[PDB]
Amino acid sequence: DAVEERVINEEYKIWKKNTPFLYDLVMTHALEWPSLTAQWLPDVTRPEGKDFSIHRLVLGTHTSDEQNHLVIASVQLPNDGKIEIEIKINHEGEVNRARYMPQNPCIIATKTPSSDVLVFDYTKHPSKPDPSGECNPDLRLRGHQKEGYGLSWNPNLSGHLLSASDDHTICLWDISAVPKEGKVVDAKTIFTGHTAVVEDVSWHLLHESLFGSVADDQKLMIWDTRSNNTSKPSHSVDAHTAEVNCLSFNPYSEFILATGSADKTVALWDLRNLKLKLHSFESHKDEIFQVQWSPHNETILASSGTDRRLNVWDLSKIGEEQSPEDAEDGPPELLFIHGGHTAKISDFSWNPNEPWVICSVSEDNIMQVWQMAENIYNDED
């Protein structure tokens, strides 16, 4: 066990030697507290000149010892850096997942380990806790508490927000009709289909009525809000052989999505026939907690999790001819293994404004903002 950390400590050092051949950019920043959550804000502010542009990122803290925080970081990326903390806002309870609303990115929804969803507006707060008036207690006695992290806004209907609820359900809130300064929003719909703990949920990127959900009952379920029966979904798959922890819809193909899970596989799915898994991506050594599609490339997905590895997959190399010496290192669809993290990667987001740039966060307070070398993705050498 103690010798297993030394294997991680030495293979970090070969990676740091491997860094100028494999990356066009590596930034590494220790945060003050580890983050479970990472999402890039959609605005870029380049000034003309400076040799950089300013991009923004949504973080959180997950500690019980101090006052918790919701963090906006500014990250300077060159155009041939610096990572500072822009906003710190006092969040009550641990930040499991933090996502912005697309119809106003100042509105950020957070998922807590309690049964609620908090919503902040960062313009309506002080930028730093120069008060430092904690609301944080001295003990926290959680009894029966296991919850998943999933939280997703509808990009086609403003205010419709899903989350993974506490007793195997999915809740829908419509925050567009906010009530008259009561500031408590009850659930519009409660979706009662899964038999174990719902881990991740996501709205469809094109149709406003559809969403997908994954859970610990090995099931991917596809729903429709116009259905009168909210106890049964429209489709149900026996997706994986273990706990399904993440899903992501393809932004270029409306029928295509991908689920990653605790059987170390990322599955590939068509919506019009869910009884056939299209492809099983296999190179993770442990449990997968995040899968995200490239917003600049149809063919490209990435996955991350417990094995300290962020794999980056390429669908256009599936079924390729391969040598025995190439097949040792993985499948031909495996484009890139990141390997900067020495602890379990909790979350990652692709940058929407600079292509191939990823921020990824792990549990040893490391945030890494990186981008692989231009020769490796363009098939050029």
């Binding site: 070969i14 051949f21 290192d329 490796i376």
Partner: peptide, 14 residues
């Protein structure tokens, strides 16, 4: 050798 080194980043490239 850079496409091969992307798939084995814990081994040194050669």
């Amino acid at each position: 050798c850079t496409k091969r080194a992307a798939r084995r980043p814990y081994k040194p490239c050669a």
